[PDB]
A paper describes a structure:
For processivity, PolIIIα binds to the DNA sliding clamp (β subunit). structures of the complex in both a DNA-bound and a DNA-free state to 8 Å resolution. exonuclease simultaneously binds the polymerase and clamp. conformational changes from the DNA-free to the DNA-bound state.
into the third class in which the tail domain is not visible. number of particles, this structure was refined to 7.3 Å resolution. panel: detail of the DNA showing the ‘DNA-bound, no tail’ map.
Author numbering:
A (entry chain D): 7 to 189, 208 to 243
B (entry chain B), D (entry chain C): 1 to 366
C (entry chain A): 1 to 927
The structure:
DNA sequence: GGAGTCCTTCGTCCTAGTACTACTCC
DNA sequence: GGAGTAGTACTAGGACGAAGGACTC
């Protein structure tokens, strides 16, 4: 059973640690089992522990005051862990989400190892870039490429993108499979340098040696 | 140099020879034909640089031997254009070909025979006759599965396999693969030769379906095909046809029978609302029932419910509707038998009446 | 035996460009660190690092062995290209190889690069020994087909033309079909009695270099690493394998290793480098010497009548010049230069006869009165105490370089003259390069790794502008580099890659920088590079290397601005018949014009050459230069050192009497230094002042004086100590005080560190004064010319207009009908836009428009225009800009009716064009 | 909305209304279908703002009124693909229209009728009916002279001149003009109207050759055409057309008749050796004799000599052969008559036996 | 030390070929 | 109604032109 997710946070840091001083605000995750969308969503909103960044606000909307009463990552720690444990996590811009994930994990102080030890972390962007080199292979790009609509959807925020990623994911990994097509003692001659050739050689080495102060052939 | 032929002896040869031409033939002499007159034998030539086509017409009226090379399309149309029973008189005047018939006169540029490219003589290894009919059915029934332009350029073509008393053809895309095996009625040595797509198109075109047998000769790196008055020669592409024995489904355990026409009609209708590029329609089979459904990007749904002979366990499989309609078009029969494995394996399809052909279209798993 | 059991005979540097990875020196140093005595470098169709190869051979005690690998065309394998390795055994082979390379380029080629016919080995034959090309050779490919008859046909050619000099190439690198080829090659070798040689087909030092080379290839070819279509012909085993590694690979065929030692002994080519093969020429039945003496005495007579047009004064002032002339003439003749002088003076004269004002650069050549006498230079050196010994020093037995340049516009005309002169193939242009510097390598690796434009450019714009910039330097200078490295996986992968490729050779080199002259065919000395059609030959050795191999060069310098002056002069001299004014000779101008100095003191020196900087205009304002000497000084003044050491303020203050002038210092001065230091108000500013002070104060020769300035540049311990003594007793011998002489020497040496070359500054400052006189003496064509020159720059065009506006210039928008090529002045219409002034439009379309206007009358309307001129010439895009610019305003009063009518009319017109061409009488009336 | 209709009523209309609709229109609703139920009537409307198509089919089966707009192409493909004799029940359900037939069920996205541009009411000005067969003749015999994409927007269409009881047709590109006028037996107003190229293409297209009267109503700026329950409205195109009396050759003095098929087969043949860009032939005509010559730059040559009925002086004139081949093809008659003026002017060419139609083709400069 | 000569790569536009659809022929 | 040929639409490839980073003394 495989898990499609992209986790939206209190903006990004472009510089230094993209996770430093940031925490999770929304989890939008869609469940895909046997390449069918079950609709068993874990879609929750979290404690910001900080200000939502002006840029992040404009991206998909979400107000700081809305995520204040909502529970913290500690109240859904085991809940979210068992939801993704032993399953496929392919995410867009993996550096961002993984950074946050492991960050929250260390904040629990239960010595819980990083998500990548019990869950399969794969970036989808890397795979798309590999498949379509020189094309924009962002999620929205691939969405439009495989004719998936992310504009006329009532679902706003993380759940929008999770849905889209699931469709993109299935499209790339369903494009079509393959007809695995088919996959002593002897003579020969020793050519001795003639006396003329030997003399040219000697003269050439003389030059090397007289001008440079060594001859490795005679060392 | 002169010859006189009747338009009607030249018409079908000329049409046939003009088929391979359109390539914007860059080496200008390729836009022309090689005429060889020697004896009372006029030889006709069509070449696309990769293959060669020879026809003879006998000359009953006065002639003088020699050779030249005249522009193909234009000469074909002139002759096709002339009335039935027209007296066509050709004659070389120095550097031009003169064509007279009646009161009309034409003076054509001429390029010398010695500039026209010749593909080499080779020696025969396998030789056989068969009815044209058999070769016609063979190609027509399966040609649709060949690649157009692939990295595996050798799949732009078809496996020819002779062995014992069997002719066996198969062709593939890398997506779907079409197979046919036929008895040929003569003991045949084992040989494999791979002919380019343009080759098979031209071969298709030379079949009038009539009773003149087709007789082909196969050399080391070439093939020659004789039907009646025409002789075809192409060279072969290097080798490595992938192993068809590997792709065969290993005991497809479910048996599924349904009327070819009904089935094809329902696919055509359902296809209108599939993915434009990949033609994805989805199949649900259960005991005595088939539900077809497909998705289109705009959330629209086309759907068929149908009465389907099927014994076996329930499973789902969807794949490209264009490829399956292509096989239903090659299946010139009322009923289809499908033998299955699973949603992630190659498939077998046969006509419930002929095991002669074998088909595979792959699934996509959505 | 002696020590060596094996040498590598198949290895490329990155200068093969199709492949190779390590630079030349590093490759040689690895070979030597491995304790092998010889090594073949066989780059693809070039010997670009041969100078470096031979210098590294000498240095390390290593014998260089000369070769190359190839792409061939034989009739036996048809269109398929196969590989060949060619060894030159001697100088016969060297010349054959030089000719072979030239022949490949002369034939032309495709994307695959230049190719040879196998039968060119008939002519290009003697003293050469051959390897098959391995699996990818003629014979290898035929062997892999398993066509024994084809193989036999192929070898037969080498049995005819290369008996005992044709080898079986042996390769065990574990790559596809090498074992099948090897099996067939061993059969052939025994069947035919043949000798074999083993190589390692080396492309890199260590197996970890493979990744970098993969990416190197991909960058050149323009393909991405993970592209399935990308050729994967190479393996990580293509590294510098040791003696022992190769000994174990081929422990079944000992003779294969031993035959490398044998071949290496037979391969001995001498190409002598670092010593001159000078060019030259005769004239009449006269000596080259005497021809120069003649043309210079009589050239001096013209200049003397220009300088002193009173013949009484010319006679009294003359002796000085004749003595200078003969003093220079003696050094020139006794060193044996006069062929050189003659070529260049002929060249300068011919470009005057034809419509070519001559390119400004002279190096420090303004120090030569002979150059001036011969019309090579433009300035009186005796007026400004200009010194020949800065430019050619007689006390030094070395390179003359007279470093001659010319204007761009007329390069083909000069290439042509020098082909008429020497033979087109006996003359060559010289390569300049591409290597992959910091910005390029980032952008190129980024695209290969599949990034959008925006991503990668966000990185490369953080790499500083500077010429010598490296990634290591970039990361220390710019804190954002370390930051994005640690914060971005894509940037990390990219810089890790860019670190391995930093500085690497990128491809074929752009054109020349300057053009070289041999005394015979250029191919007598090197093989060249030529363009896609095998034309426009350029030398495979670069500027420093090609001249170190002995041949004299001729530079491009496109300070083009000559073109401006030229055009403005043509336009001024048309105003001759309009009011009977004689045509103007920029060389004939007075040096003291007040309008010129008024405008300069107002700092309005935009487009006045070298004084266009805002900062430099700030300096001019403070400095208030009121004589020509001050104009020569401006380039020497605008430098960070002199300004920020108080020297600029001293100079400005001593100029206006606000600080007393000393010769040179308040305490440490002497009046005999006054003639030397006069022009600079007692400040030691120039290299040539240093030299004059050693001559006058301390009795140095001018050449010994130049040797002291050179020694002050180096600052070495022993060096100075000796000259410091000569300088002491030389002053003593002239009765000048020792302590004063030495204390002035300390000041000279302080300021020698900043000291700029006055002759080099003056040659260029002459051109600034020309642009100054021209601007002021008529701010009226000049402006047009300024704009013409920098037609490309929108920013500058805008700047120039703002300059016009401020001036009382200004200024009309274009007209398609009335306009000339570029800006033109009718008397009343101060200015009309040129056509070329329009931004987007190409040169072809501008000419098209005007051409049509010429044949027809002035364009009546929109429609009229379209009909006369097809879409080929003027695209719709083009047309749109024209309307929007307002060149059309006269016709289309409404900037917008005509915009709507465009597309339809264009198509209409053509439908008309085709109707004309064909065919065909039409019907009805009209619209 | 809910109704059920008979495949057979709906099929021909579906083909009529879909066939001109461009694959990808500029304004999406142009690809969708207006469906209107009122009374026992389904009205289907396909338009492109230039022309407008309405079809009606009577509803004998249970229904519920309403309107919608669905994708034209796909709807037509669906209906074409339906099984023989299919009675299809369709229903509006929320945002989808559901299409049923037998066990097949389909579901299409929907745009409302209200969004669709209702083009304008106008009052009829001139009214008449005529046999379908006359109209089809009039149009077929003449349509080949129109331009493609002309700046003189009034040539991209066909000029009708109506006077008394006659209608006359004309279309032209400035090199040839094509007329047919025939008596229709009704007193009309005096008025001329130019209908757009695509309008006339489609009107011709729907002219099932049969019994049905064709009735048309023209307004001042639109025209409407009724055949049965297909009801057509288009705007008209404006410009100030040139005078056909200046294009008609004034008094062609020299006369030439010849057998049309012989003439035509010979020109088809001379056409082959004409330059591809210019399509040029030269005509040499002399007393009772006719000679065609052409050439190309390649210096290939054709000559025809034929005997023709000609009284008059010799004459030399060249044409674009495409222009005359196009009239000879449209002229479906046995004997032709040429009446010639001079080398710089119009030539008259016509069926020797009819004069309903008129052709002038302009000469060339070679 | 600055600027010009240098090409090459990126973006846009036009031209040519191929495929599909529709009309005319069989 | 189906097959063959023409016409139209869409895709693919190549050339042109404006931009940029670089290596020359």
């Amino acid at each position: 059973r495989q898990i499609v997710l992209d986790t939206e946070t209190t903006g990004m840091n472009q510089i230094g640690a993209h996770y430093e001083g940031h925490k999770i605000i929304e989890i939008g995750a869609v469940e895909v089992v046997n390449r069918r969308l079950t609709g068993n969503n874990f879609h929750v909103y979290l404690k910001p522990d900080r200000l939502v960044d002006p840029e992040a606000f404009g991206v998909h909307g979400i107000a700081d005051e809305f995520l204040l009463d909502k529970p913290t990552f500690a109240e859904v720690a085991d809940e979210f862990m068992d939801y993704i444990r032993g399953a496929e996590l392919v995410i867009h811009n993996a550096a961002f989400d993984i950074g946050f994930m492991d960050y929250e994990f260390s904040l629990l102080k239960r010595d819980i190892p990083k998500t990548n030890t019990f869950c399969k972390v794969t970036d989808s962007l890397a795979v798309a870039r590999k498949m379509f080199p020189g094309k924009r292979n962002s999620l929205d790009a691939l969405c439009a490429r495989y004719e998936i609509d992310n504009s006329k959807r009532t679902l706003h925020g993380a759940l929008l993108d999770a849905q889209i990623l699931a469709e993109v994911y299935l499209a790339m990994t369903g494009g079509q499979l393959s007809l695995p097509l088919a996959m002593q003692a002897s003579k020969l001659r020793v050519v001795f340098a003639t006396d003329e050739e030997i003399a040219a050689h000697e003269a050439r080495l003389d030059l090397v040696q007289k001008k440079g102060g060594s001859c490795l052939w005679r060392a | 140099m002169k010859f006189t032929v009747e338009r009607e002896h030249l018409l079908k040869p000329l049409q046939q020879v003009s088929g391979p031409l359109g390539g914007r033939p860059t080496l200008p002499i390729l836009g022309n034909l090689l005429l060889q007159v020697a004896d009372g034998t006029l030889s006709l030539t069509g070449t696309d640089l990769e293959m060669e086509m020879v026809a003879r017409v006998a000359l009953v009226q006065p002639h003088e031997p020699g050779a030249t090379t005249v522009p193909a399309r234009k000469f074909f149309d002139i002759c096709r254009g002339l009335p039935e029973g027209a007296e066509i008189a050709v004659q070389l005047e120095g550097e031009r070909m003169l064509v007279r018939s009646g009161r009309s006169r034409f003076s054509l540029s001429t390029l010398p025979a010695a500039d026209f490219p010749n593909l080499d003589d080779w020696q025969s290894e396998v030789e056989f006759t068969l009815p044209q009919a058999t070769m016609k059915r063979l190609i027509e029934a399966t040609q649709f599965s060949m690649a157009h332009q692939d990295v595996r350029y050798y799949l732009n073509g078809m496996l020819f396999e002779t062995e014992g008393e069997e002719l066996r053809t198969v062709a593939t895309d890398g997506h779907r693969l079409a197979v046919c095996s036929m008895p040929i009625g003569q003991s045949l040595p084992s040989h494999s030769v791979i002919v380019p797509r343009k080759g098979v198109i031209e071969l298709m075109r030379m079949l009038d379906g009539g009773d003149n047998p087709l007789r082909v000769q196969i050399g080391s790196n070439n093939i020659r095909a004789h039907v009646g008055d025409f002789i075809f020669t192409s060279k072969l592409v290097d080798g490595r046809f992938p192993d068809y024995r590997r792709v065969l489904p290993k005991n497809p355990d479910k048996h599924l029978e349904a009327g070819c026409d009904l089935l094809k009609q329902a696919f055509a209708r359902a296809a209108i609302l599939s993915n434009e590029k990949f033609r994805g329609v989805r199949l649900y089979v259960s005991e005595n029932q088939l539900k077809i459904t497909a998705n289109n990007p705009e959330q629209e749904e086309a759907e068929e419910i149908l009465d389907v002979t099927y014994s076996g366990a329930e499973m789902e499989i969807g794949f490209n509707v264009s490829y399956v309609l292509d096989v239903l078009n090659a299946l010139k029969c009322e009923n289809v038998r499908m033998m299955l494995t699973d949603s992630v394996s190659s498939v077998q399809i046969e006509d419930a009446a002929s095991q002669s052909a074998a088909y595979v279209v792959m699934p996509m798993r959505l | 035996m002696s020590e060596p059991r094996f040498v590598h005979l198949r290895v490329h540097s990155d200068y093969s460009m199709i492949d190779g990875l390590a630079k030349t020196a590093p490759l040689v140093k690895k070979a030597a660190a491995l304790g092998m005595p010889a090594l073949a470098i066989t780059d693809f169709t070039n010997l670009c690092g041969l100078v470096k190869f031979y210098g590294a051979g000498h240095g390390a005690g290593i014998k260089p062995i000369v070769g190359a690998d190839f792409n061939v065309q034989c009739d036996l394998l048809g269109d398929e290209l196969t590989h060949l390795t060619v060894l030159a055994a001697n100088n016969t082979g060297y010349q054959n190889l030089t000719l072979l390379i030239s022949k490949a380029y002369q034939r032309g080629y495709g994307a695959a690069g230049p190719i040879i016919d196998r039968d060119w080995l008939i002519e290009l034959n003697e003293g050469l020994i051959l390897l098959s090309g391995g699996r990818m050779g003629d014979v290898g490919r035929s062997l892999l087909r398993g066509n024994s008859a084809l193989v036999d046909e192929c070898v037969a050619f080498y049995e005819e033309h290369f008996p005992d000099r044709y080898f079986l190439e042996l390769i065990r690198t574990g790559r596809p079909d090498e074992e099948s080829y090897l099996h067939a090659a061993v059969e052939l070798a025994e069947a035919r009695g043949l000798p074999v040689v083993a190589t390692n087909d080396v492309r890199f030092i260590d197996s970890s270099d493979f990744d970098a080379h993969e990416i190197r290839v991909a960058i050149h070819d323009g393909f991405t690493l993970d592209d399935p279509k990308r050729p994967r012909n190479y393996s990580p085993q293509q590294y510098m394998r040791s003696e022992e590694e190769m000994c174990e690979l081929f422990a079944d065929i000992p003779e294969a290793l031993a035959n490398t030692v044998e071949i290496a002994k037979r391969c001995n080519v001498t190409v002598r480098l670092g010593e001159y093969f000078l060019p030259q020429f005769p004239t009449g039945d006269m000596s080259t010497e005497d021809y120069l003496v003649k043309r210079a005495k009589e050239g001096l007579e013209e200049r003397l009548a220009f300088l002193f047009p009173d013949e009484e004064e010319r006679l009294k002032r003359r002796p000085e010049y004749d003595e200078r002339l003969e003093t220079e003439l003696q050094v020139i003749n006794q060193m044996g230069f006069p062929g050189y002088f003659l070529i260049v003076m002929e060249f300068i004269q011919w470009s005057k006869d034809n419509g070519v004002p001559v390119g400004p650069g002279r190096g420090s050549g303004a120090g030569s009165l002979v150059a001036y006498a011969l019309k090579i230079t433009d300035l009186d050196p005796l007026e400004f105490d200009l010194l020949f010994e800065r430019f050619l020093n007689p006390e030094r037995v070395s390179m003359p370089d007279f470093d001659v340049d010319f204007c761009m516009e007329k390069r083909d005309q000069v290439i042509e003259h020098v082909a008429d002169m020497y033979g087109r193939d006996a003359v060559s242009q010289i390569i300049t390069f591409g290597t992959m510097a910091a910005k390029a390598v980032i952008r190129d690796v980024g695209r290969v790794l599949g990034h959008p434009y925006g991503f990668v450019d966000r990185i490369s714009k953080l790499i500083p502008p500077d010429p010598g910039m490296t990634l290591a330097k970039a990361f220390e200078a710019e804190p954002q580099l370390p930051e994005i490295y640690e914060a971005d996986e894509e940037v990390k992968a990219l810089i890790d890659m860019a670190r391995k490729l930093e500085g690497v050779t990128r491809n074929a080199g752009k054109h020349a920088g300057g053009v070289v002259i041999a005394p015979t065919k250029i191919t007598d000395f090197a093989p060249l590079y030529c363009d896609e059609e095998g034309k426009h030959p350029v030398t495979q050795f670069d500027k420093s290397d090609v001249e170190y191999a002995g041949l004299v060069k001729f530079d491009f310098l496109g300070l083009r601005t000559l073109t401006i002056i030229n055009w403005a002069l043509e336009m001024i001299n048309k105003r001759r018949a309009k009011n009977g004014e004689p045509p103007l000779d920029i060389a004939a101008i007075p040096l003291d014009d007040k309008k010129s100095f008024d405008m300069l003191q107002r700092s309005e020196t935009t487009a006045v050459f070298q004084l266009e900087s805002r900062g430099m205009k700030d300096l001019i304002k403070r400095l208030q230069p009121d004589c020509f000497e001050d104009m020569i000084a401006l380039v020497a003044l605008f430098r960070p050192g002199p300004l920020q050491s108080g020297m600029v303020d001293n100079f400005i203050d001593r100029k206006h009497g606000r600080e007393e002038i000393s010769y040179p210092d308040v305490q440490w001065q002497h009046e005999s230094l006054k003639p030397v230091l006069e022009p600079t108000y007692g400040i030691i500013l120039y290299q040539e002042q240093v030299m004059q002070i050693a001559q006058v104060l301390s009795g140095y020769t001018l050449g010994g004086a130049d040797m002291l300035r050179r020694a002050m540049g180096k600052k070495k311990p022993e060096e100075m100590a000796k000259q410091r003594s000569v300088f002491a007793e030389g002053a003593e011998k002239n009765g000048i005080n020792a302590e004063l002489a030495m204390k002035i020497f300390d000041l000279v040496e302080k300021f020698a560190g900043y000291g700029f070359n006055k002759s080099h500054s003056a040659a260029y400052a002459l051109v600034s004064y020309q642009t100054l006189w021209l601007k002021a003496h008529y701010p009226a064509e000049f402006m047009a010319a300024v704009m013409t020159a920098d037609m490309d720059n929108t920013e500058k065009v805008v700047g120039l207009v703002d300059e016009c506006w401020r001036m009382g210039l200004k200024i009309l928008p274009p007209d398609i009908n009335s306009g000339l090529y570029h800006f033109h002045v009718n008397d009343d219409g101060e200015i009309v836009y040129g056509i070329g002034a329009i931004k987007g439009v190409g040169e072809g379309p501008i000419e098209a428009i005007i051409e049509a206007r010429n044949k027809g009358g002035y364009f009546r309307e929109l429609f009229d225009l379209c009909a006369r001129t097809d879409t080929k010439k003027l695209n719709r895009r083009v047309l749109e800009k024209l309307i929007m610019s307002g060149a059309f305003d006269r016709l289309g009063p409404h900037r917008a009716a005509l915009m709507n009518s465009l597309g339809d009319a264009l198509k209409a017109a053509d439908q008309h064009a085709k109707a004309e061409a064909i065919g065909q009488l039409d019907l009805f009336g009209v619209l």
